[PDB]
Amino acid sequence: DQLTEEQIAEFKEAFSLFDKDGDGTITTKELGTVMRSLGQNPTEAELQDMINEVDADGNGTIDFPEFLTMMARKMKDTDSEEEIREAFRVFDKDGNGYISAAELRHVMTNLGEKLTDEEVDEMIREADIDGDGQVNYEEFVQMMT
Ligand SMILES: Clc1ccc(C(c2ccc(Cl)cc2)[n+]2ccn(C[C@H](OCc3ccc(Cl)cc3Cl)c3ccc(Cl)cc3Cl)c2)cc1
Ligand SMILES: [Ca+2]
Ligand SMILES: [Ca+2]
Ligand SMILES: [Ca+2]
Ligand SMILES: [Ca+2]
């Protein structure tokens, strides 16, 4: 089938979270910044190894079609569940088990991202299956699939 404009917009927003300077490519330095904000501490060589798996043309960076190719592979690492829980803990800064729009705003400002209130509210709505206005652990996990 064909992607909708909403699906293209969602892929574009996800790419922009890594592409901090907006030049259309994701570098090892930009990938490292995101991973550190989600509780990880990869070395530069490990970041290069991760990019190399996705980088098809071999120019050291990830472009939009390479990013989409990555998503279409449904690839996973051995400690995926631990990394997803670690990332979940980062967002839920008040320890109540729900990620609020305020807590998502906190992680985005720490990452150096500039997002409007409508963009933050749409990200919550995108993941909020039960409709309580916040993202619980199961919704945060389901979002990854
Ligand atoms: Cl905790 C977690 C688990 C899985 C993923 C997915 C994924 C899904 C959607 C999107 Cl928009 C980007 C990546 N996934 C697919 C491939 N890589 C490998 C790597 O994941 C790095 C990573 C690991 C752990 C954590 Cl906590 C965050 C990240 Cl970004 C990676 C991610 C983004 C780019 Cl641009 C390039 C690479 Cl190689 C991860 C992401 C986070
Ligand atoms: Ca970039
Ligand atoms: Ca490339
Ligand atoms: Ca919370
Ligand atoms: Ca919810």
Numbering used by the authors: 2 to 146
Anything the authors wrote about it?
Calmodulin (CaM) is an essential 148 amino acid-long calcium binding protein that is ubiquitously found in all eukaryotes and one of the most conserved proteins known to date, playing a central role in cell physiology as a key sensor of intracellular calcium signaling. CaM has two pairs of EF-hands (N-lobe and C-lobe) connected by a flexible linker. Calcium binding to EF-hands triggers large conformational changes that result in the exposure of hydrophobic patches and promote interaction with target proteins. Calmidazolium (CDZ) is a potent small molecule antagonist of CaM and one the most widely used inhibitors of CaM in cell biology.
Depending on the molar ratio of holo-CaM and CDZ, we obtained two crystal forms. For the holo-CaM:CDZ complex prepared at a molar ratio of 1:2.2 (1 mM holo-CaM), the unit-cell parameters, merging statistics, and systematic absences were consistent with space group C121, while for the holo-CaM:CDZ complex prepared at a molar ratio of 1:10 (1 mM holo-CaM), the parameters were coherent with space group P6122. The two crystal structures of holo-CaM:CDZ with one and two CDZ molecules are quite similar with a RMSD of only 1.4 Å over all Cα and exhibit compact and globular structures. CDZ-A and CDZ-B are bound to the same region of holo-CaM and are mostly localized in the N-lobe. Comparison of the theoretical SAXS patterns of the two crystal structures generated by Crysol to the experimental SEC-SAXS pattern of the complex indicates that the holo-CaM:CDZA crystal structure is in excellent agreement with experimental data with a χ2 of 1.4, against 9.3 for the holo-CaM:CDZBC crystal structure. Taken together, these analyses indicate that the holo-CaM:CDZ complex exhibits a similar conformation in solution and in the crystals and suggest that a single CDZ molecule is sufficient to induce an open-to-closed conformational reorientation of the two domains of holo-CaM. These results suggest that the part of CDZA, which remains solvent-exposed once interacting with the N-lobe of holo-CaM, likely forces the C-lobe to collapse by a hydrophobic effect, closing the two lobes of holo-CaM on themselves, with holo-CaM wrapping around CDZA. The HDX-MS results appear therefore consistent with the crystal structure of the holo-CaM:CDZA complex and confirm that CDZ binding to the N-lobe dramatically stabilizes both lobes. Overall, the CSPs are in agreement with the binding interface observed in the holo-CaM:CDZA complex and further indicate that CDZ binding affects distal regions in holo-CaM.
